Amino acid sequence: QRKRLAEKYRECLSNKEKILKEIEVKKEYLSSLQPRLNSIMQASLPVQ
């Protein structure tokens, strides 16, 4: 039972690490899409 509780705690820590990785991926995606939208607007303004 202690080994099963340790395995459940390891699975919960892996789920928390996956949630933190998803939050970091969302933050990096927003930080990259900010300059990407800026470059897209700068490209659209020359075509406009």
Place this chain on the structure above:
Amino acid sequence: QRKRLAEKYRECLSNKEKILKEIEVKKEYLSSLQPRLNSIMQASVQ
């Protein structure tokens, strides 16, 4: 009166040629705008 109608008909022919020039150029501008919109769409997370 025939002088006035002839001169006003020539003025209406010139105005119709101007409306056609406006329209032709206007149509070209519209086409350019459509291309610009397409480019913007291509540029366009979301």
